[PDB]
Design a protein around this nucleic acid. Structure first.
Lengths: 65, 437, 50, 121, 171
RNA sequence: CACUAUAUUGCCGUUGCAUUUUAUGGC
């Protein structure tokens, strides 16, 4: 079972936008399915899957995170 | 009035602030507790995990499922966990339910991850009962861990550590949650979600067998490994750690004494608890009790040999000579005296008080100072003749008036090895002290 | 000839018990008998499984 | 000079016990009195450790007469249960011996420990 | 990499043969790589010796250099002086690489089996799976080496041959 | 949850009932 964490949560009301570096830990899955992880991220935040957006991913060497 | 405002702040906002607030050091009389022993004949009991239902869990809707009674769970070394009612204070803990493990719980694949068999191979080590009271996890030297139901004790699920040598050595629940930090002796700390019945993350970076773990409300873990004289504090949500080492050498302690008396070096850190999210205490192999913060590496306050020194052997079983002068000289004075290296330690969370236990026959209670840089005695609890595997404290009373029940599991050998030095009349049982005001 | 399965493992028990007893009464400069007595009690309690 | 003479102090006791633990985890340590004297007269023994509170003391005091004959160093420590916990085993050992091995990863720590105990004697 | 001055000596050929043999190497280029970094590390160590004692350049950069070499582990902490860096040599450098280090740690039973199970991505140093032999494990991470979590020698699923043969034995 | 309702300790030594009670020390 995966666990998505966030870090360096800095707000930015210049775009009314809360930006951060997200890191997912999937111990045995291949990848975390951008749509599925962004809707889980919207769930752990206030709301709006359509208004959350995560874009800069890369899976580190050896898998897992 | 102002007192009701203060009581509403001390309801929860102090504990979410995460500093030591529940001050009852001098408020607590000690020397007249109701110090009842209970004998249970199941062959070196090794753990105690009590569970009290917390009322109105940070909103309302009092607790989770009876309605409002406490519990305790305990673990043998011959593969038997037992569920005790403890709720009736000034009464003995009554045995309720039982679960054993035999040889038939050995699988037949035997060479992979699958330890799907529900009971236990051998040598169950320690338990932890979940704060929502649905499950109790158990785990021992058979590289599994089990979720038992808290009512019929039925193997809900079995979680293998998936390792050649991942013996589970101590479990801890993050309070008011069901995340579980298990401390596996292949130098690693595992995290599990009980309601998801899965493994969140495994976290490395230690250096020897991570033999004790503790946790509190926020996402901290404080673990100690044995033969590396260190203590790791894990902060999960940024994924980093903090390494607090020892560093008390006997020649420098002699420099601190020589202004105007025996003490010795540090074998191994053994036990931990954390008094808040900002200080924790450990107990070592030289009896030393360390009080430690977040900000410093050295000990803030290290109490010396805590439970005293073990008695030297006699004339009669040291050399086998006939003359008492030579069998006196074979004792070598005090030079081969070794301390009562402590075996369990517990701090009530956010409290002025903690307790320590070894096989000196007696629990020792300690009170931190107000400025949080020193601590001292409070008394002595002598009915626990034997080795103390684990202490847990359960409470009752009003917002200010307290009624405590200390539950110390007592065996006649240490919960990992065998390692006795003539333990004198240790009944396997539970020490249970009612202490009030 | 000496040291009089169920006899084999008790022969091994008696063997390392008497080697230990030999170490005791050799290197002790003026030996006592009490450790020999407790070794005797140990080995008789051991063979009392039969 | 009572009977178990080269008895280590606290710091040297602790460093020889931690090198004992990593040797036992590397499977370079043979434990117990008769396995110790067996590897002593096999000839693969780097140095030997003996717990000087055993019941009684002569059961391992047979070992100096072999070890100082065959020129390997020997130390006493103050506690059998300390040596047992440091060997990583459930019962209290009283004697322990590091087998010589050039494929070890602990070789420099072994040699530093050996130099300290040889200057102790 | 760096080529030698006179590479075709029989002495240097027997040198490369012995080092590659008892440390499990793949050609002479590995020897030349770590010999080049050894050469630059003691050529930077000797001029600090030739300059004056307690020149703060010498003091600070010598303590920097030996603080690096103690942490890599080629210099034991009993010899914390700069001329021991001059006394250092190349077998101490290829003793600390991950292949030889895991073979000394056990779990590999031969140096080339150590190299090949490193390259099968089986061995992780603490957290990170490493699939290169020439790694130079530091003295802290010496005792962090065990099999990967996602490896059949660790605690993962049995491998391809194992489950294929288990299926054919189910047939 | 609602029912149906079925009517101190593994061994060894103990205070004490108007059967429980009760805290000690041997494996």
């Amino acid at each position: 079972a995966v666990t998505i964490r966030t870090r360096k949560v800095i707000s930015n009301p210049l775009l009314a936008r809360k930006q951060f570096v997200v890191d997912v830990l999937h111990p045995n899955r291949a990848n975390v399915s951008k749509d599925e992880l962004r809707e889980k991220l919207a769930e752990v935040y206030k709301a709006e899957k359509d208004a959350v957006s995560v874009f800069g991913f890369r899976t580190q060497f050896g898998g897992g995170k | 009035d102002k007192d009701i405002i203060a009581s509403r702040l001390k309801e929860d906002v102090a504990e979410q602030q995460g500093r030591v607030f529940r001050y009852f050091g001098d408020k607590l009389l000690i020397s007249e507790a109701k110090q009842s022993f209970t004998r249970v004949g199941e062959n070196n009991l090794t753990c105690i995990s009590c569970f009290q239902p917390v009322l109105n869990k940070y909103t309302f809707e009092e607790s989770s499922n009876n309605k409002g009674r406490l519990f305790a769970y305990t673990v043998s070394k011959d593969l038997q966990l037992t569920k005790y009612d403890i709720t009736d204070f000034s009464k003995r803990p009554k045995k309720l339910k039982y679960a054993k493990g035999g040889a038939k719980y050995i699988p037949t694949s035997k060479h992979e991850y699958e330890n799907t068999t529900e009971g236990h191979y051998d040598e169950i080590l320690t338990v932890a009962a979940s704060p929502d009271g649905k499950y109790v996890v158990t785990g021992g030297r058979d590289r599994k861990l089990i979720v038992w139901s808290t009512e019929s004790l039925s193997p809900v699920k079995v979680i293998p550590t998936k390792d050649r040598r991942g013996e589970v050595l101590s479990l801890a629940f993050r309070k008011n949650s069901d995340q579980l930090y298990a401390s596996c002796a292949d130098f690693k700390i595992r995290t599990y979600s009980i309601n998801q019945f899965s493994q969140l993350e495994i976290l490395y970076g230690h250096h020897d067998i991570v033999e004790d773990i503790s946790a509190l409300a926020m996402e901290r873990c404080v673990t100690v490994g044995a033969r590396d004289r260190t203590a790791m504090l894990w902060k999960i949500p940024d994924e980093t750690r903090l390494t607090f080492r020892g560093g008390d050498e006997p020649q420098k302690l002699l420099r601190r004494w020589m202004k105007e008396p025996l003490f010795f070096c540090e074998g191994s850190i053994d036990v931990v608890s954390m008094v808040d999210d900002f200080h924790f205490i450990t107990g070592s192999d030289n009896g030393n009790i360390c009080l430690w913060s977040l900000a410093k590496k050295k000990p803030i306050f290290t109490e010396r040999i805590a439970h005293g020194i073990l008695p030297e052997p006699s004339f009669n079983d040291i050399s086998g000579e006939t003359d008492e002068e030579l069998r006196k000289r074979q004792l070598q004075g005090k030079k081969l005296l070794q301390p009562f290296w402590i075996t369990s330690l517990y701090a009530i969370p956010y409290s002025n008080v903690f307790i320590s236990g070894s096989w000196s026959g007696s629990l020792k209670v300690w009170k931190i100072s107000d400025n949080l840089r020193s601590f001292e005695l409070l008394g002595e609890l002598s009915g626990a003749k034997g080795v103390v595997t684990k202490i847990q404290v359960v409470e009752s009373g009003k917002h200010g008036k307290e009624k405590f029940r200390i539950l110390a599991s007592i065996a006649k050998e240490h919960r990992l090895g065998r390692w006795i030095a003539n333990v004198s009349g240790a009944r396997n049982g539970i020490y249970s002290a009612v202490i009030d005001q | 000839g000496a040291e009089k399965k169920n006899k084999g493992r008790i022969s091994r028990y008696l063997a390392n018990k008497c080697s230990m007893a030999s170490r005791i009464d050799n290197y002790s400069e003026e030996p006592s008998n009490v450790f020999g007595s407790v070794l005797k009690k140990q080995v008789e309690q051991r063979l009392e499984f039969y | 000079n009572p009977k178990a003479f080269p008895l280590a102090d606290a710091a040297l006791t602790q460093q020889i016990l931690d090198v004992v633990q990593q040797a036992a985890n590397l499977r370079q340590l043979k434990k117990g009195a008769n396995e110790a004297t067996k590897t002593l007269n096999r000839g693969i023994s780097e140095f030997i450790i003996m717990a000087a509170d055993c019941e009684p003391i002569e059961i391992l005091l047979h070992l100096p007469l072999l070890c100082e004959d065959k020129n390997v160093p020997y130390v006493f420590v103050p506690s059998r249960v300390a040596l047992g916990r440091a060997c990583g085993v459930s019962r209290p050992v009283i004697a322990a011996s590091i087998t010589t091995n050039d494929a070890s990863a602990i070789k420099t720590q072994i040699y530093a420990v050996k130099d300290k105990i040889e200057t102790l004697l | 990499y760096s080529t030698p001055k006179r590479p075709y000596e029989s002495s240097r050929l027997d040198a490369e043969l012995k080092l590659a043999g008892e440390f499990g190497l793949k050609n002479k280029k590995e020897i030349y790589r770590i010999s080049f970094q050894l050469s630059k590390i003691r050529r930077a160590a000797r001029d600090l010796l030739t300059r004056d004692e307690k020149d703060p350049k010498r003091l600070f950069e010598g303590n920097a250099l030996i603080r690096r070499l103690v942490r890599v582990g080629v210099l034991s902490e009993d010899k914390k002086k700069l001329d021991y860096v001059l006394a250092l040599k190349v077998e101490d450098f290829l003793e600390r690489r991950l292949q030889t280090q895991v073979y000394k740690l056990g779990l590999a039973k031969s140096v080339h089996h150590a190299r090949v199970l490193i390259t099968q991505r089986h061995i992780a140093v603490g957290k990170q799976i490493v699939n290169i032999p020439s790694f130079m494990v530091r003295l802290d991470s010496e005792k962090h080496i065990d099999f990967a979590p996602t490896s059949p020698f660790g605690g993962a699923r049995p491998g391809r041959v194992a489950r294929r043969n288990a299926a054919r034995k189910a047939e």
